[PDB]
Amino acid sequence: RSTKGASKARRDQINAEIRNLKELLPLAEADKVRLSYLHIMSLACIYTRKGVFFAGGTPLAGPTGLLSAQELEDIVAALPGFLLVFTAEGKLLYLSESVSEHLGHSMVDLVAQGDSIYDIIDPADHLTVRQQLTMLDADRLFRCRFNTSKSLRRQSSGNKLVLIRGRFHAHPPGAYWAGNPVFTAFCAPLEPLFLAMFQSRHAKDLALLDVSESVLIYLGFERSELLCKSWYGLLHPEDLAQASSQHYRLLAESGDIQAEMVVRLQAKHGGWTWIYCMLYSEGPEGPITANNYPISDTEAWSLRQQLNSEDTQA
Amino acid sequence: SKFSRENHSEIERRRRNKMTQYITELSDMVPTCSALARKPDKLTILRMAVSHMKSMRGKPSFLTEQELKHLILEAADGFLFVVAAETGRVIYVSDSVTPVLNQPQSEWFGSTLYEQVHPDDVEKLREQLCTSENMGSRRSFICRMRCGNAQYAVVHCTGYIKAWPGSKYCLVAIGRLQVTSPTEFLSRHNSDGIITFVDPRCISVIGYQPQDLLGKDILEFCHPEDQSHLRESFQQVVKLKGQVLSVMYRFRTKNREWLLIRTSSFTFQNPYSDEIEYVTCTNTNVK
DNA sequence: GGAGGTCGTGAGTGAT
DNA sequence: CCATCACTCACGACCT
């Protein structure tokens, strides 16, 4: 007979429950008004997954009543990255506010188009990311480009590089948590306290013209004992070819080339330290500047799988 | 033209599909609902959703101050402890001390952090716990903490001093593990034959420790009749600019026996200077 | 009859 | 204030 006025109540009922969700969503009402119904039904899923994952676990929360006024909500601002939590299939569970500093886009802004990690990162990395999320070893570190802001695309040369260091956690008893673990990660940008770095300056034959003084912590050598030593004299003979070919690439008929490599360096007392090494040229045939990132063998293996797949797809 | 209307059709289509897929992801990940096979009325789906979104609490942020805690403690792998500033007595520790340090959580409770650290680092640990009003309330220190199962692991701790809300002050901190990780062995030599590096696999093949061989000529461990042959092979390797040469000779073990060793060697040259950084030698026990 | 979900189309809007 | 492709609402016939 008459489907209008009858089928209307259905729509204005589901679009009233959506609205009773958005007035509950933990956001600020400066942006809680420009939120499409599609956002609410694509952004409240993340909150609901947070709720069901956390409320359904043993109270393994480290402390109880110590950081209990705002210090936990203040250290997050001072950390050199942003927290990111998701499922192995790519669906997010939490993204701290802090992302606004690092990608230039709000949490209310990135995930408003979609549900999953693959709506924020660059579609050129989707394969690589997927690889690392399918490969028991509770550790995973991989390097990835995230979509940036239009306010920082005007000032940075594209989408940001981000190191992603995390581990797959013990999933709670559930239906979707079954067979789908939860990956918690610290994600810091690499294109300029937990982010271990000693930095170095090399000449055109990778000799240590200078090094940061935090090297003593991760190698046992004072800066005094390392100056003018040959970097190939700190390497492990297995990683010889990798560093040599990256050094060739770094020495071309131009400058301004990034060179990625995961290597081992020999410490003072002789233990081998895993170093993710980002070499860039601060000038064509000028200086060599290297960011060094100490990592664990699991993280080194993950990042090597990354770079192997990348050089494969060149 | 003719498609400024039907493109709109598939646009609204993709919108409806987005919300169907989302309302299904709500129809898989809510407890009051995941306990069926009949995916109920979509309105009732959203209603069980609002039920589970009236569950817990939280100008604003996203999650409460025990979620962010678990998260920062899992991203920054390690444990969180809370010690009294003056007495050093352990008021509190998280269970994560067990997978990090292998000590049971009952052995940390009550004891002093001075017992759990290395004696040389005890004065340094006191220096950082002393409350003399030195931004300036955050502490950061590297010490050696006792491992369970002599046995010590380097721990980098970061925390801050707070009045507990003679234990008028206490340090609340997080401790991260500063991990940083047969028949043949590798060795590196300079142009002259002086050993610059040895793989610690030498202990097993020839019985010597690495520092027992660092800085000596490789010929002081060769057998007198074979010195000339090895010296000529080294001299040729230097000229072979990366080619792999192979020589056989009798090597003097640490128990003063003579082991037959097959050494494969090649120079490594630096891609810009072409100078011999070292001669890489893979030494294989053959007989 | 009575839910309950879809679809192509009409319109209100925040935007360069 | 006025087109413009693009969002993002609502609508009423019309299947399962």
- What would the two tokens of residue A274 be? 């895993």
For the segment 12-41 of chain A, residues whose CB is within 7 A of strand C? 34
Residues of B124-159 as b/e, b for ≥16 C-beta within 10 angstroms? ebeebbeeeeeeeeebebebebbeeeeeebbbbbbb
Method of determination?
Answer: X-ray
Which amino acid is it at B33? C
Resolution in A: 4.3
CA of A12 to C1' of D13 (A): 18
The answer to whether the B6-52 and B184-285 domains have the same CATH topology is no
DSSP code of residue B131? -
CA angle (A186 as vertex; A266, B71 as ends), nearest 5: 125
A288 close to A202: Cβ distance less than 8 angstroms: yes
Contact criterion met (CB below 8 Å) for A43 and A22: no
Residue B205 to residue B285: CA distance in whole angstroms: 7
CB distance A294 to A274 below 8 Å = yes
Residue B5 CA distance to nucleotide D3 C1' (Å): 18
Centre a 10 Å sphere on the Cβ of residue B59 and count the other Cβ atoms it contains: 6
- CA–CA separation, A33 and A44 (whole Å): 15
Alpha-carbon separation of residue A234 from A199, A266, B183 (angstroms):
15, 6, 24
Interface of A with B in 199-258 (CB under 8 A): 204-206, 217-218, 230, 232-233, 237, 240, 244, 247-248, 251
- Give the gap in angstroms from C-alpha A185 to the nearest C-alpha of chain B: 5
Rounded CA-CA distance A231/A209 in Å is 10
Q: Which of B60, B65, B271 sits opposite A244 (nearest CB)?
A: B271
Residue A281 CB partners (closer than 8 Å, separation 6+)? A250, A255, A256, A257, A287, A288, A289
For residue B12, how many other CB atoms are within 10 A of its CB? 10
Non-local (6+) Cβ contacts of B196 within 8 A are: A233, B188, B189, B190, B214, B278
Contact predicate A197/A218, CB 8 Å = no
Phi, psi of A100 (to 5 degrees): -60, -30
Q: Residue at minimal CA–C1' distance from D6?
A: B8
Q: What is the CA radius of gyration of chain B?
A: 33
Among A183, A172, A277, A182, residue whose Cα is nearest residue A235: A277
User: Is residue B130 within 8 Å of residue B122, measured between CB atoms?
Assistant: no
Phi, psi of A213 (to 5 degrees): -80, -5
B70 touches strand C (CB under 7 A): no
Rounded distance, CA B122 to CA B120, Å?
Answer: 6
Residue whose tokens read 């000449």:
A203
d(CA B187, CA A38): 64
Instruction: Look up residue A111 and give its DSSP letter.
Output: T
How many C-beta neighbours within 10 Å does residue A51 have? 21
Residue B157: both structure tokens together = 């701790």
CATH architecture of B67-177: 2-Layer Sandwich (3.30)
Please name each of the domains of chain A with its CATH number. 13-59+67-189 (3.30.450.20), 198-312 (3.30.450.20)
Is A101 in contact with B93 (CB distance < 8 Å)?
no
Cα distance between residue B240 and residue B247, in whole Å: 14
CA of A190 to C1' of C15 (A): 34
Helix locations, chain A, DSSP H? 7-22, 37-55, 72-78, 99-102, 107-110, 126-134, 150-153, 215-219, 223-226, 240-250, 297-312
Q: Which of residues 70-109 of A touch B (CB under 8 A)?
A: 71-73, 75-76, 79, 83, 85, 91, 94-97, 107
B62:A96 CB<8 A? yes
The answer to whether residues B274 and A251 touch, using CB atoms and an 8 Å cutoff, is: no
Break chain B into its structural domains and give their ranges: 6-52, 67-177, 184-285
Angle among Cα B84, B111, B81 to the nearest 5 degrees reads 50
From A245, which residue of chain B is nearest by alpha-carbon distance?
Answer: B271
At B152, give phi and psi (nearest 5°): -135, 145
Partner residue opposite B180 with nearest CB, options A76, A79, A218: A218
The distance of A229 to chain B (nearest Cα, Å) reads 10
Strand order in the sheet with A182-189: A92-95, A82-87, A182-189, A160-169, A140-146
B6-52 CATH pick, 3.30.1370.160, 3.40.600.10, 3.40.720.10, 4.10.280.10? 4.10.280.10
Per 3-state DSSP, chain B is made up of helix, strand and coil in percentages (nearest 5) of: 30, 30, 40
> Dmax of chain A from CA atoms?
90
Most B CBs within 10 Å, among A7, A8, A11, A17, to test the B interface: A17
**CA dist., res. A304 & res. A307, Å (int):** 5
Measured in angstroms, what separates residue B13's CA from nucleotide D7's C1'? 14
CB atoms closer than 10 angstroms to residue B231: 15
Cβ A273 vs Cβ B178: under 8 Å: no
Size of interface A-B (CB pairs under 8 A): 206
Q: HSE on the CB side for B210, CA within 13 Å? A: 13
Pairing of strands B258-269, A208-211: unpaired
Residues 5-64, chain B, CB closer than 7 Å to nucleic strand D: 7-8, 11-12, 15
> Widest CA span of chain B, in angstroms?
95
Q: How far: B14 CA to C12 C1' (Å)?
A: 20
Specify the 3-state DSSP secondary structure of A41.
helix
Q: Which nucleotides of C are covered by protein (CB under 7 A)?
A: 1, 3-11, 14
Could you write out the DSSP letters of every residue in A188-254? Answer: EES----S--EEEEE-TT-BEEEE-TTHHHHHS--HHHHTT-BGGGTB-GGGHHHHHHHHHHHSBSB
Q: Cβ–Cβ contacts within 10 Å for residue A234, how many? A: 20
Tell me the C-alpha distance between A180 and A281, whole Å. 42
A30 touches chain B (CB under 8 A): no
Q: Please tell me the CATH code under which domain B184-285 is placed.
A: 3.30.450.20
